Design a binder for these strands. Structure first.
Lengths: 83, 73, 305
DNA sequence: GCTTGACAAAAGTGTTAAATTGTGCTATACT
């Protein structure tokens, strides 16, 4: 009483996952390889609610305003022009 | 291991003259100080330093308190 | 060197400690490069490649910024080690405490502000300490406890020690629950969480040669006498059902799921025999009072358990 | 042998509030 689905990890490996036929097949499955993998059937349903990570630039932006950054860069390039 | 028991008496700063004075009748006492190539009291503290604390570059402040802090302290 | 930490201390000692003016210098270069990067990256979207001389110098502003970030870190590595010294012996290896501290140092550099005019060590000490203590809460326990629970376990400890000193004794669950403003039953539940496991590989023989681990029974192991008797019980039921009618036993077997191991509802059994669930309810009660008849039941009595 | 309607307990579902859990952060100076 089982249906088998196949997924493909980003690196090309493929894995067979037996499921119960009455169940709804997930579009991604954590795989024996250790990576996420994508169903080879139609979907591929969803974006999976991505929230981009925090970066050094973000932490710098929330203190220095873009204008302050410009002047400081002006100071830097002008120091470079002098040779 | 590999230590010249004479070299440490130089680590304290005692001059070779006192070695012939105190050693006296000891034959190997005088013969070993002639065999040791260590010259100076602070240079013997260095020959004792690198084998005891291998991997750490020494300093005149560390090399001298090394002996005092190990036992006298 | 001979040790592992003696080796890491050698390489951190090879850098030079900055003074106030240098920290401000590097800080500017770091922010300067970052903005230089975000700006050029903005060009990638809309293109508009820069002039040759303006492109070659922007690539340098960034390279110099990262060289600054790396230099600001390598200069303060001593500060991390100085903080981790005090957190040893608490269940994390010294190097791990150091590495986690370095992680804090990295964020201090990212979030550091040079316009406030404060010495760098002032701000970085916060992150390096939080990085080390936060790390200990996620790691040092074989069975992890979340931060918020590790926060109360510690608090409950100090209360007990402070309460220990004032009472010249250890406080009872009621005194502790009172001083901490919680129910005494909670402080017990908390004190069960703080228990830490033990090594199965310990030698408790004490001129017994044995280790603890080999004294542990296997409770799920198969018991020969039971499985054999259970097989004999399975046969005795097969017989008792033979006395019942073809449909009487058929309903009993589907009712408890003897054949499939899957029990069935009164309605479902009525679907195979083509009747209403009530009719099956009736046939049930009758075959059960038939099984309760002493002739069939007398033999199965010894199987109670 | 059998079915029908009324009926209440038991079992699932969906919706919400409470709780539990994760993460960021703290600016005298401290190497």
């Amino acid at each position: 009483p089982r249906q088998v689905a196949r997924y493909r990890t980003d690196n090309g490996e493929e894995f067979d996952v037996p499921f119960a036929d009455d169940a709804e097949i997930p579009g991604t499955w954590l795989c024996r390889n250790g990576l996420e993998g994508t169903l080879i059937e139609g979907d591929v349903p969803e974006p999976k609610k991505v929230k981009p990570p925090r970066t050094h630039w973000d932490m710098l932006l929330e203190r220095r305003s873009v204008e302050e950054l410009e002047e400081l860069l002006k100071e830097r390039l002008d120091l470079i022009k002098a040779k | 291991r590999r230590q010249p028991v004479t070299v440490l008496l130089k680590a304290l700063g005692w001059t070779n003259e006192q070695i012939v004075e105190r050693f006296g009748f000891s034959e190997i006492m005088m013969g070993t100080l002639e065999k040791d190539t260590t010259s100076g009291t602070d240079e013997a503290l260095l020959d004792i330093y690198r084998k005891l604390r291998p991997g750490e570059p020494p300093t005149k402040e560390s090399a001298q308190t090394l002996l005092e802090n190990l036992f006298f302290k | 060197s001979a040790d592992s930490v003696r080796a890491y201390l050698k390489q951190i000692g090879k850098v030079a400690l900055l003074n106030a003016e240098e920290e401000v210098e590097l800080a500017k270069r770091i922010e300067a490069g970052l903005y230089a990067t975000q700006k050029l990256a903005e060009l990638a979207e809309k293109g508009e490649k820069l002039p040759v001389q303006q492109r070659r110098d922007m690539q340098w502003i960034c390279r110099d910024g990262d060289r600054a970030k790396n230099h600001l870190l390598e200069a303060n590595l001593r500060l991390v080690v100085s903080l981790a010294k005090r957190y040893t012996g608490r269940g994390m290896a010294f190097l791990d405490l150091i590495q986690e501290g370095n992680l804090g140092l990295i964020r201090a550099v990212e979030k550091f502000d040079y316009t406030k005019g404060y010495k760098f060590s002032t701000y970085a000490t916060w992150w390096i300490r939080q990085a080390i203590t936060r790390a200990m809460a996620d790691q040092a326990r074989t069975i992890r406890i979340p931060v918020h629970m590790v926060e109360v376990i510690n608090k409950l400890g100090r209360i007990q020690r402070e309460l220990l000193q004032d009472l010249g004794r250890e406080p009872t669950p009621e005194e502790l629950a009172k001083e901490m403003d919680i129910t005494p039953e909670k402080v017990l539940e908390i004190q069960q969480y703080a228990r830490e496991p033990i090594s199965l590989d310990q030698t408790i023989g004490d001129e017994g040669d044995s280790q603890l681990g080999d004294f542990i029974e296997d409770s799920e192991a198969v018991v020969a006498v039971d499985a054999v008797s259970f097989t004999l019980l399975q046969d005795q039921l097969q017989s008792v059902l033979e006395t019942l009618s073809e449909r009487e036993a058929g309903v009993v077997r589907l009712r408890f799921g003897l054949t499939d191991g899957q029990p069935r509802t009164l309605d479902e059994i009525g679907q195979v025999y083509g009747v209403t669930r009530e009719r099956i309810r009736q046939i049930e009660s009758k075959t059960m009072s038939k099984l309760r008849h002493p002739s069939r039941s007398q033999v199965l009595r010894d199987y109670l358990d």
